[PDB]
Structure 1
Amino acid sequence: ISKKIVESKLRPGMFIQNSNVVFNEQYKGIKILGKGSFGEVILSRDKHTGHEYAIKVISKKHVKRKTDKESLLREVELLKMLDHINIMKLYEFFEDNNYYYLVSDVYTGGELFDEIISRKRFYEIDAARIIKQILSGITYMHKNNVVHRDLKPENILLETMIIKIIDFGLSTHFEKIGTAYYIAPDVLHGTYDEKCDIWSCGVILYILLSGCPPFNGSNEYDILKKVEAGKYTFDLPQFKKISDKAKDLIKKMLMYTSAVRISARDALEHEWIKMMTSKLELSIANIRQFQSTQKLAQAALLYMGSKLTTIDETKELTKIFKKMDKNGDGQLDRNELIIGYKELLKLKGEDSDLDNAAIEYEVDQILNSIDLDQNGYIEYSEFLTVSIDRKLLLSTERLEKAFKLFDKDGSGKISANELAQLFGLSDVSSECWKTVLKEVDQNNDGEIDFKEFRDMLVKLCNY
C-alpha cells in the first residue's frame, strides 16, 4: 500500500542557488517548484539573459520512453512553435545521461480545484468561463495535431481568472490517487485519437457543476469499472438546479463512442458556453470534500511511505557507516556522511550534480538540527535518529496542511466513514485500519481528531 508508491530528496520551496547546479551549461537552478507529472520542476535562470523558466527534470533510470528519439524531437519542434494563452509554453528539450529536461514558462496559479476551493463560493458562470478557456486551449492544440491524453485537474493551473494547461503533448512519449476518474475508455481500450481530451474535460465539467465525479468508487478498481461501462447519471440533488443546456453539453462530451463524441471546437461553441460567458451557487462544499479527501489520502499514503522508506534506508546507512567507522567511536565527519549516502545509491546502481546537491542539502539540514561539536565530528546514530525525526516532522506538516483543507467547516474530526474512503483510496485493509481505530478512539465516539489520525498511521506502519 504505502512503500510501493514512494519506493524526492528535494523539497518544494527550497532554494538551491548556493549549489551552483547548472543545466545544459545554460540554466542556473534557483528554486524547487514541486513534483510534476514525470519528475521534478525547478525554477531556473538563463545565465546569459536573466530570463527565468520552469524546468521539468525527469529521471531516465526511473522513467521509460515509448517512442524513438526522432519522434520525440519532432513533437518538441512542433510544440516550440505553438502559442496559446491557455497552454503552458514549451521552449526546449535537452538531456544528459541522467535526465530528460523540458524547459517551459514559469507556472502561474494553483491547481484548478485547489484554487476553486480556497474561495468561499463558486458559481455557474465561473464554471462556464473555466471550461471555455480549457476548450479554447484544447481546440487550438487539436487543430495543430497535438493531443494531451492525460487531461486532469492537476494539469490545469488557474490564476485567480486565467487557465493554463500543462504537459500538453508529453504522454505520447513517456511512461497518484486521482488518476482514474478522468481517463477515457478510449485510452483504456488503447484507441488512439484526440477525442479522449473531450471526455476528460466533460468529466471535469460534471465535477465543477456537482462536486462529485460521474464515475465514482471507493478505490481504483471500482472507478475503472464504472469508466469501462461508461454509465453515469444526473440523479444527484446538485443537478436539480443545473440547466438542460449544461446537461446537454456534458452528455455530448461523455459519449462512449469517440466518433460520436463532440469535438472541442463544437463544444466551445455550445449554447451553454455562449449564454453563460456572454456580455447559481454551485456546491463548493462538495468540490472541497472531493478534492480534500483526495489530498488527505495522498498525504496519509506519503506519511506512511516516507516513514517506512526512511526506516529501510536508515538500516542500510547504519551498515555503511559501521564499515566506515574504523576506530569504532561511532563518529564521522560531514564528508564521510556524504560519501555514505553516495555509497547507498551505488548499491541501488546509480551514477549526478543535482543529486549531489540534494545529498549535501539533506545532510546539512540534519546537521543544522543538532548542536554540533566544534571538532567537526558527529555520532552517526544521532545523525540518523535526528534524520528520522526530521522526515516525520515534514510528513506531519504535509498531513497538517491537507487536514486543514479537509476540516474547513468541520468538527476538527474525521468519521469512521471518511476513514473508509481515505483508506479505500490508499488500499489499506478494512481490518487493519478498524483494528487501529479501536486502539486510538478511546471514548468510542466513532470519530477522531488529527493527532489520533496521525497515531493511526504510525500504528499501521507497525502492523
Structure 2
Amino acid sequence: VPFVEDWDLVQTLGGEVQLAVNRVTEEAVAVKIVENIKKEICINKMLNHENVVKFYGHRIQYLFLEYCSGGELFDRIEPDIGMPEPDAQRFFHQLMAGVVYLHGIGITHRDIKPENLLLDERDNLKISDFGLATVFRYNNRERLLNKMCGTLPYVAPELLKRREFHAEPVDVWSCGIVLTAMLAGELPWDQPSDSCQEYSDWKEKKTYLNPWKKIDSAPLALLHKILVENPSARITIPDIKKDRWYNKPLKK
C-alpha cells in the first residue's frame, strides 16, 4: 500500500519528543529525536509488556515509540492535594506490574518519576524512557551498581551514601516516592540525606507533618515499609503485593 511509510509531525510532546501521525492510517506514534543512544535502543528492543511503552523501531537518531493519549501521570497529580486514593492504588498496581516485568528480565529503569509514567487511552500506566536504564542481571548473575543516576527527590539514600548498591531496592524506593506524590501532591524532601530536615523528621516518625498528615494510615503503613533507609531491610515487590492497603478494595 503506497504512502503507509509517511509520517506527519503534528506537535511537540516534550532532544525532543514529537507526536507523529501516519498519512494513510492516521495511527499516532511518539518520535524521540536525539554510546547512551545505542544502549537505549538495545534495552527498548528487549521490552514487551502492557505497562511498558512500546518500541516500534529506530532510524540524528529517530526512536519510534508508543503514543499515550492520556499523557503523563505528573499532570494527574493536583499540587498539595494528589488524586483520589482508588486512582493512586490502580496506578500503583500497574506501576508494580511494570517494575516486576523489568526486574524479571534483569533491567532497572533508574529514573522512575511521574514525568516518565505515561497513560494510554484507557488510563493504563506505561513506564517510559529507558535512556538511564541498565542491565543489572545477566546469565542469572547480579551486577551491583555504582553510577549516580536518577532525580534527587526520587533517589534512594544508598545511592548517595554507598559506593555500590543493589539495583532493585532503588527502583522500589522511587515507586514509594511516586506513591507519596499521588496521595499528597507533594514530594517529601529535596533528597534523602540526614542534612535534609524533612528526611530526618520521617526517620524520627513525625507523621503528623506534611506530606504524611494527608495520607490515610493504610497506605502510610505501606510507605513506612518502602521508605526504609537500609535497602536490605526495605520491603521487596513480592511483599508489597501482600501489603494490606495494596490488596484493599477501593472505589470512588
Range into which the TM-score falls when normalised by the shorter chain? 0.7 to 0.9
- Please tell me whether the aligned partners of residues 36 and 131 of structure 2 are also in contact (alpha carbons under 8 angstroms): no
The count of residues paired between Structure 1 and Structure 2 equals 227
**1:242 deviation in Å?**
3.8
SS of the residue aligned with 2:18? strand
Change (3 A) 1:196 1:53: same
| Structure 2 residue 163 is matched with structure 1 residue 182 | no
User: How far did 1:57 drift?
Assistant: 0.8
Counterpart residue number, 2:12: 33
Of 218, 223, 240, the residue aligned with 1:267 is: 240
Q: Runs of at least 4 residues of structure 1 off by over 3 A?
A: 45-52, 71-74, 158-161, 186-190, 223-231, 237-244
Flag the structure with larger Rg. Answer: 1
* Distance in 1 between residues matched to 2:208 and 2:54, nearest whole Å: 40
Task: Give the secondary structure class of the aligned counterpart of 2:78.
Answer: helix
Give the alignment's Cα RMSD to 1 decimal: 3.6
> What residue identity is the alignment partner of 1:184?
A
The DSSP-based 3-state class of the residue aligned with 1:122 is coil
In the alignment, the residues of structure 2 paired with residue 155 and residue 185 of structure 1 have an alpha-carbon distance, to the nearest angstrom, of 21
Q: 1:90 to 1:115 in 2, by over 3 A?
A: same
- Asked if structure 1 preserves the Cα contact closer than 8 Å seen for 2:184 and 2:212, the reply is yes
Greater helix share, structure number: 1
The corresponding residue for 1:91 is: 56
Pairwise mapping of residues 18-417 of structure 1 onto structure 2 (< 5 A)? 26=5, 28-35=7-14, 39-45=15-21, 51-58=27-34, 65-66=35-36, 69=38, 74-79=42-47, 82-84=48-50, 86-94=51-59, 99-117=60-78, 122-158=83-119, 161-167=123-129, 169-172=130-133, 179-188=151-160, 189=162, 191=165, 193-216=167-190, 223=191, 225=193, 231=200, 232=202, 233-236=206-209, 239-240=212-213, 242-277=215-250
How far off is 1:163 after superposition?
2.0
Partner Cα distance (1:45, 1:123) in 2: 33
The 3-state SS of whatever aligns with 1:42 is strand
User: 1:182, 1:32 → 2: CA distance?
Assistant: 29
AA of the residue aligned to 1:248 = A
Deviation at 1:195, TM superposition (A): 2.0
Q: Which has more strand, going by share of residues? A: 2
Between the aligned partners of 1:76 and 1:130, the Cα distance in structure 2 is: 22
TM-score (norm 1): 0.42
User: Any idea what SS the aligned residue of 1:273 has?
Assistant: coil
CA distance in 1, matches of 2:214, 2:102: 33
Q: Is the 8 A contact 2:8 2:22 kept in 1?
A: no
- Unmatched runs of 5 consecutive residues or more in structure 1: 1-25, 59-64, 217-222, 281-463
Q: 1:270 to 1:27 in 2, by over 3 A?
A: farther
What percent of counterpart residues are identical? Answer: 31
The question of whether the paired residues in 2 share the 8 Å contact of 1:42 and 1:54 is answered with yes
Counterpart of 1:104 in structure 2: which amino acid? L
